[PDB]
From a paper:
Sterile alpha motif and HD domain-containing protein 1 ([name]) is an important regulator of cellular 2′-deoxynucleoside-5′-triphosphate ([name]) in mammalian cells. Although the HD-domain contains the active site, [name] hydrolysis requires assembly of [name] into homo-tetramers. Here, sequences at the N and C termini of the HD-domain stabilise inter-monomer protein–protein interactions and incorporate four pairs of allosteric nucleotide-binding sites, AL1 and AL2, which regulate the enzyme through combined binding of G-based (AL1) and 2′-deoxynucleoside (AL2) triphosphates. Using combined biophysical and X-ray structural studies incorporating nucleotide analogues along with mutagenesis experiments we have now discovered that [name] uses a bi-metallic Fe–Mg centre to catalyse [name] hydrolysis in a reaction similar to those catalysed by HD domains in both human and bacterial phosphodiesterase PDE enzymes.
Co-crystal structures were determined using either wild-type (wt) wt-[name](109-626) or a [name]-[name](109-626) AL1 allosteric site mutant that generally produced higher resolution diffraction than wt co-crystals. A further effect of the [name] substitution is that [name]-[name] is activated by xanthosine-5′-triphosphate ([name]) rather than GTP through AL1-binding but nevertheless maintains comparable catalytic parameters for [name] hydrolysis as those observed for wt-[name] and GTP. We first determined structures of two co-complexes of [name]-[name](109-626) in the presence of Mg2+, which is required for tetramer assembly and catalysis, with (i) [name] (AL1) and dAMPNPP (AL2 and active site), and (ii) [name] (AL1) and [name] (AL2 and active site). SEC-MALLS analysis revealed that all four dNMPNPP analogues, which have an imido substitution at the α,β-bridging oxygen, when combined with GTP, support the formation of stable [name] tetramers, albeit to varying degrees. Near-complete tetramerisation was observed with dAMPNPP, while dCMPNPP promoted the least tetramerisation and [name] was able to support tetramerisation without additional GTP, presumably by occupying both AL1 and AL2 allosteric sites. Further investigation using inhibition assays revealed that all dNMPNPP analogues were actually competitive inhibitors of [name]-[name] triphosphohydrolase activity, with inhibition constants (Ki) ranging from 0.78 µM for dAMPNPP to 0.052 µM for [name], with the following rank order of increasing affinity: dAMPNPP < TMPNPP < dCMPNPP < [name]. The resolution of these structures varied between 2.0 and 3.2 Å, but all structures contain highly homologous “closed” tetramers of the [name] catalytic domain, with pairwise root-mean-square deviations (RMSDs) of <0.5 Å across all atoms in each tetramer.
Author numbering:
A (entry chain B): 114 to 276, 284 to 599
B (entry chain C): 115 to 277, 283 to 599
C (entry chain D): 114 to 277, 283 to 599
D (entry chain A): 114 to 277, 284 to 599
The structure:
Amino acid sequence: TMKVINDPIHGHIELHPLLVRIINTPQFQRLRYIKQLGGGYYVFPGASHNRFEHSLGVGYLAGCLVHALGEKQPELQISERDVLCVQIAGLCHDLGHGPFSHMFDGRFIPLARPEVKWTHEQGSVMMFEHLINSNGIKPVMEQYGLIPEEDICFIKEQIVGPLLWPYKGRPENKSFLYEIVSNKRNGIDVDKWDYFARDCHHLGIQNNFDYKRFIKFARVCEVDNELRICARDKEVGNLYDMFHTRNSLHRRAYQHKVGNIIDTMITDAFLKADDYIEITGAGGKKYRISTAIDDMEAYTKLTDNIFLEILYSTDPKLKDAREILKQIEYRNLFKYVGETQPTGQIKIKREDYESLPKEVASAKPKVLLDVKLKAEDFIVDVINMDYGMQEKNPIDHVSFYCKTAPNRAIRITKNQVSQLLPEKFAEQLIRVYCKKVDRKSLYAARQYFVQWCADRNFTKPQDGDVIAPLITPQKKEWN
Amino acid sequence: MKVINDPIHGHIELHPLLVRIINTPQFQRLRYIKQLGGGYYVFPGASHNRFEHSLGVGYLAGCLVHALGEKQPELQISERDVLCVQIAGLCHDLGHGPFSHMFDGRFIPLARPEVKWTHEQGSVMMFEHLINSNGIKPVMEQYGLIPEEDICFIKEQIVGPLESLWPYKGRPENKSFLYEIVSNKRNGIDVDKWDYFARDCHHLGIQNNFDYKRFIKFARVCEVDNELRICARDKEVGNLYDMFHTRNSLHRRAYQHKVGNIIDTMITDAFLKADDYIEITGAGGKKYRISTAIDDMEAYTKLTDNIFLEILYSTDPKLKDAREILKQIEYRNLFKYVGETQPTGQIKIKREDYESLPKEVASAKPKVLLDVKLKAEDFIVDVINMDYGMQEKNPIDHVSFYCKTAPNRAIRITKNQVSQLLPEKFAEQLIRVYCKKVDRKSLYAARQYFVQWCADRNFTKPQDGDVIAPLITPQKKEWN
Amino acid sequence: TMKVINDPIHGHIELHPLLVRIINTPQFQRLRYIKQLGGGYYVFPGASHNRFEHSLGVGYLAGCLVHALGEKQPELQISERDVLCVQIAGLCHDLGHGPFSHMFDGRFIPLARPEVKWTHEQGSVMMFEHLINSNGIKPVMEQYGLIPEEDICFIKEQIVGPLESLWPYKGRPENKSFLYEIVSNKRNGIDVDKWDYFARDCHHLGIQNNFDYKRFIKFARVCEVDNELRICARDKEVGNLYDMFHTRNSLHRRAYQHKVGNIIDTMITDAFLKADDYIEITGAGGKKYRISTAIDDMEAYTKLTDNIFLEILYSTDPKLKDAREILKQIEYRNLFKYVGETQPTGQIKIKREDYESLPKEVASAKPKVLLDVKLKAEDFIVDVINMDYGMQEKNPIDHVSFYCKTAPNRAIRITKNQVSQLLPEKFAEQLIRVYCKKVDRKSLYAARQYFVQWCADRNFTKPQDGDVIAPLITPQKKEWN
Amino acid sequence: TMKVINDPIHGHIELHPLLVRIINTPQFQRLRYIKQLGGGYYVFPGASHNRFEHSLGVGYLAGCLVHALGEKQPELQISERDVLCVQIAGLCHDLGHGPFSHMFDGRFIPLARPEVKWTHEQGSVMMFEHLINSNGIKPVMEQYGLIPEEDICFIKEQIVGPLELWPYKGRPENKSFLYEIVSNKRNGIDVDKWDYFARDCHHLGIQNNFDYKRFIKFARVCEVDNELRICARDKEVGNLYDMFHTRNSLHRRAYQHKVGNIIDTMITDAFLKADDYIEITGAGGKKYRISTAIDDMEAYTKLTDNIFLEILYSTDPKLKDAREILKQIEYRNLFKYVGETQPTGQIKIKREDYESLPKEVASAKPKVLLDVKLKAEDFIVDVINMDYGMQEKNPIDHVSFYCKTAPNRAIRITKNQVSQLLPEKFAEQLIRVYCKKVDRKSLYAARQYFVQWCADRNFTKPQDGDVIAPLITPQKKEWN
Ligand SMILES: Nc1nc2c(ncn2[C@H]2C[C@H](O)[C@@H](COP(=O)(O)NP(=O)(O)OP(=O)(O)O)O2)c(=O)[nH]1
Ligand SMILES: Nc1nc2c(ncn2[C@H]2C[C@H](O)[C@@H](COP(=O)(O)NP(=O)(O)OP(=O)(O)O)O2)c(=O)[nH]1
Ligand SMILES: Nc1nc2c(ncn2[C@H]2C[C@H](O)[C@@H](COP(=O)(O)NP(=O)(O)OP(=O)(O)O)O2)c(=O)[nH]1
Ligand SMILES: Nc1nc2c(ncn2[C@H]2C[C@H](O)[C@@H](COP(=O)(O)NP(=O)(O)OP(=O)(O)O)O2)c(=O)[nH]1
Ligand SMILES: [Fe+3]
Ligand SMILES: [Fe+3]
Ligand SMILES: [Fe+3]
Ligand SMILES: [Fe+3]
């Protein structure tokens, strides 16, 4: 029989025995100890939720969508084998997230090991392999009609994309299965649908996107010699609103100015603790926090725990790291100075991020300062907000259908929908903080910042006339 | 105090004066007017009526004014001011007609083109009638109000000024912020909106993305141009753009739903046909029609959604034309939706031209063999202005903000200071075409006329255009 | 294709073309103009919701449960024909409700026409027949694989029970008895009508619902019980099932039997009785029917809705002046005043026959207190209310079959003692509410004295507020100290 | 100014600067790392929520109730000092919970240190003292008008009851009602309950049937036996019985879930085995064990749910026994549930006898002479007392009520005055038996021992009893 489990977002989920068997392993249960929104918990006290339950929900929704397409269109010949594989992918899709989720792959690893190009997804594939092998799942897969050679490839391919038709796991006549868990074409996937619903529930924000409705009007059609998922013509509006909702959650919560500074402070403490923390891996080899990603037996033991390990330690080697985390407890965080954006079409390249604190201190504001501030006193956090496809409109990469001809796929441009939609689909936000907390240094920091904005032809800080009233009239373009 | 349980706002407390206003025919009337008119016939959850919206707006008006008072005693907001703001909120939609916006938005403009009449003007008149016919003036005095000054203040909250120095007679400039609570003429950020977002969502089955409670926590009165106004905190600017997005989104999904609108036009049509033969007893026994009941409030008190069922259940042969339209709604033989389109460039369609557009669609000569020719009376063309509440203007350019560092110093925040992902324009037009002939052959023809008419006037390609009229869409160079 | 419709309780419901065809008729759309909770709207301003949308939801849930049983147990051979019939029943199950729902079949018709035994359900069967015939549905049923002879009986049987020991149903055999337990469960009362209105009424009332129907469906299963295939719940759900009936009783206490909701219902009923004689409703062949007699002809009853309230209120006919004055008194909020509530003791049931006589008894009490005003029996209203777990004095859980994880085809019983000592001792009781038609301060004082005395006289329970409202009368009774 | 914080249950809470200052300390932030429902997370995957946010909410609701009583009844002379103190108590009320909340004070400490009588509350008082002293809060309290001598006593008294006629030193008899807000010793109706109902439901995926906001609207202080207490309105008596029903229902479904409890016993077991070899640095560097950290608050500050993962991730061979239990939880090789039963008549099982019950189950001689024999160490018998918070008493008999007609006159309402459908008793016991041997053969045996043991002690028939032990159930005359 089936196992039932009660998620507060999705209700009573049914779990196939194979899924239960995958779930009840150290590699998966690990996700109970990794928070979804990392440092966001330290701003939204509701956001205690962990990857474990996100992972169940993505598994659940993956099943819903593939099973729905099957009932509506038997011609597709979606097998119970295909359904199980899609569920397993959904279930295991975030297996490779590190401590504090996106803080790890987004802030820490890029600083700790700049040579590597590593992502949460690559980790998931590796950790999935480790889960299968270390728990004897392959026999159980066979028992329930799967073919490990073909299907383990298919599952991995659903997660990271491909390791003519680039996939070895399934033929072109089932390409639509690759658009369920992680949609490379346009980004409309069930990972999104779950975390919108889930993050909102815990954050204390209401979610404006109806995934259930999208499933009712979803359908597979032929597009360029390939069978893809298509939405109904009328849903085009709701799809633009899906990406709006996403961007809106990033603005309010995920990229919250203090959430991000807590993430940078935790990252900083990890960098300082890196050298002196050992994690036992395969064959007893010792791995560091930054190197545990190379061996999955070590990475299985690397969770949010590492924060409290550092905090509670008495090792004097970890004193520098422990002091940063103690400063978070007491709430002596680095102070937020302000936010700004580039103008024209000036993109700030990732290569230049290291240099920006130097530039802020280098500004010469025509105002008498109490204190001079060095470049090490500033932090400059650059954030790319987009609709998931850098500068592109993802709706231009969605296929639609009409009531009158439901097998005939079509495109819908932006002009066909509304003039009130966004003009661009990507931008950059630049947040500046100051490590010196006191009244005198904060005043100075504000002057350096608002000047630096004028110097580089950036947008006027929203509060700019208040924080630096002597600097804002200097720029002709701001009047 | 009386407590009452609204499913949106919880247990509301009602002041005795409010209870006394509520328990009158003029107010209880609102129990029999649906919030979303014809929308009930598309969203079966939307059974909710104006009565309960009216209570909630009254409630939120109290919340906001009471909150400003606690946070800023310097404003000297009196318990008299609070009561007046509550009364305005409570009575703000008193003048809605049968099926709410269908009445002031479709019916009255067709039935009586000479008049410029709104739900709000009706509210002021109906408020006056409520006060006089129920002896409220003594009760207002009993609770510290001054009817001369305050009844003006209440009416002014609802419709704006009753006639660039200070236009209000009800309160001085040092209390201008009170006029921004119930119906905000400056920018549109008011508690009417906050209630109906929450309420309509609850009943529609859509989730609401706007947190009014949060906005209240970061609201504050500051001096702006020699006048005390409500200001939001700098950080809320994003949430305010999202407020108007939420609004526009509710209009797109629900309020301007293609079938909701066609049901509204069909009910309006049946009212126009029934107008002449329905009498409503007014003041001194005078007889008023549906279209003329707005002139006398004793008559208008008896004009509700009932009028639909009165027509439907009637046996008078004079009402047969009207009754047949309403019977066609029951059976679901609605006028068929052909498609939607928009103008291009910045070519605005003037209101004067709306009458002429069915003629233009029939006048199109599509290069396709048609089974049926269709006359202009067979088409309906519904033009809809979607905006952020201030025609072509960005309402956030008319909001004052404040910073944590200087909370009495008001500032402005432009669009460029916030995000490049915000809208370029703040108004547009949608043109929906329907066909009165329902059959398979006429609908095909209608689609050809429509998609041609779109090409003829350099409008946008209908989303489904390549499917419904595949022989017409390649004709236009601009659509390839 | 399917039609999709967005209910705020259940989400996006799919409607089969046959159902759409049934929905889009005057007989069904009528339900848009009948409120679910009748006079409750005048106490809970959220409760604007109408039968129409309840009806859609019951149709939806009926589909969910039958479709779920089918997937989990193919051996049952549940056909797409069976599924459609169960949906149609669910959809049409409340078709026969009158103006203000339960006020009509529960208060008005019993007073207006005491000779008749009539219910909302009997009306539904009749109105279903009328819907089918007047809209040519029978051809459409055949088109989608139904057999009108057999299936229209099956649908009617789902609604009212048997149209009349052996197997009592003609619509389906004993090997599909479980289908009769979905829409209206005669065995124990666990049905999808309940599940929808809990969720729906709560949503609109502003009360939260403590019952998870989705969960019950996941652990539902058909087993053999006494040579008959019935729905069974899992052993562990027994607690949640007792809580289902608790939730029901709790909704009745808070909302449905609210003291003022009920007085508004009696006042509207009263106004209908006074308007009855002078309101004509055109029926079949032009014949004239009254409000009380429209139940006899469905073409008339199709036009009888909540409208009738506003028809009376807005009228100028002097024949309707008595009725119109009652409804105007509701607008102004001059309602009959609530005096208090009480219960019988021991095991003294008050028979329905005696309800007429109780106002006489209250006025007949001789309270040992100086009164300014004497009150006659016509001044009092006494409303008697039977609260139960749906099966008069019986525990409905004693009529539920259960199954275990270890043996899922073997049905069992679970007694009350096996579950908890904190469950109810009895499963039915009576509440007696007394109101006074005279509103003034002096008459209300008097009414309270008559009432609290009458309670002592008949060995009823002490009113909760009794020591306050009648402090000179409560020490008189030895049993209350 | 005020700090705003967004809790998903209560909305945007305002935090007074003094509260912020208390919140931002190691002793308080500690609560971020303790789960509300301990091992329940391993059954309800929604239940990730921690004490931190419960603590904020209780602080919030404490403010709501005291501030509401103040507005409705100025005669009480509730000061802004009183309000702050009530908030601080609410905020700090669960400061002393251990790893996995109630598992610690309810299972672990009673086994690890049977000599001691220790509770989460006693810990809170001690941890509150430590918080104040180690963070220099006393100056800040004074700055905002508090008097540390009197008020720190008042706060502690709100949490644990009297620290030693009128038993309280923190406030006089004319403010006794303040002691009924955070932790109500009289009847149990407090805001701790109100928060966790709402919160646990939100995260569990169960809906909550209790309206705390409504209760506040109809709450009021009256004189009762020469003392000013909180009273509810007469009509709320039903909703109050339903409050305790809701509580009992949450215990049945979630908190005392058969597997949640077995995971709690397994974690407790692993803690007992790890106790001796885990050192936690305390005050002056002294070494404390898990069981002894309760004696020194500097040590206890570092004792959180972490300790689970510390054991799990360790390589010390001294911790191998403990680490193996926790690894068995990961793999889901939990001790197997055999069944549940209750006593009959009025046979209470005394706490003294709990140790002996596994012996009794193995000692049963079922007449199906068994192919594997099981020893007493193979069985776990978990006894659970379900009540309405006051052992065998009806807590509604300890609530004072008032009537609309005389709102200062307090009264009592008995059970008979309300309903015959209420509970007969207000306490009972549940006995769950599990078996440590997991295999098919031992589980069969365990079931026979159990169902016999039930017959032997005249307990209730297990629900599944006829299925699991069909040879044993006809033996007992009383079960047919
Ligand atoms: N909504 C709700 N969820 C519940 C309830 N009880 C448990 N859950 C949640 C907790 C879990 O998330 C899920 C399963 O709990 P079980 O139904 O008790 N199933 P298990 O494996 O214990 O027993 P078996 O092997 O006997 O089937 O439902 C309840 O009454 N209500
Ligand atoms: N959530 C909830 N709302 C309720 C409940 N009971 C009533 N309401 C709703 C219905 C209404 O919206 C509101 C008032 O109903 P009452 O508090 O019962 N007040 P009334 O005027 O009858 O009592 P009096 O004159 O004796 O003061 O509460 C309940 O138990 N729960
Ligand atoms: N949640 C939600 N409900 C919606 C939305 N739009 C409509 N509804 C609700 C209202 C209705 O209950 C239902 C159907 O609305 P349509 O999807 O517009 N379908 P119709 O028959 O008009 O179009 P066709 O024949 O072209 O498919 O969904 C929306 O964006 N969101
Ligand atoms: N619903 C909602 N909650 C939000 C939002 N933004 C933050 N929160 C939540 C997160 C927090 O729980 C709370 C406050 O976050 P901030 O209002 O951003 N205040 P902070 O102290 O950063 O700014 P300052 O010191 O300048 O006043 O609201 C939002 O847009 N919406
Ligand atoms: Fe994910
Ligand atoms: Fe309004
Ligand atoms: Fe029903
Ligand atoms: Fe607590």
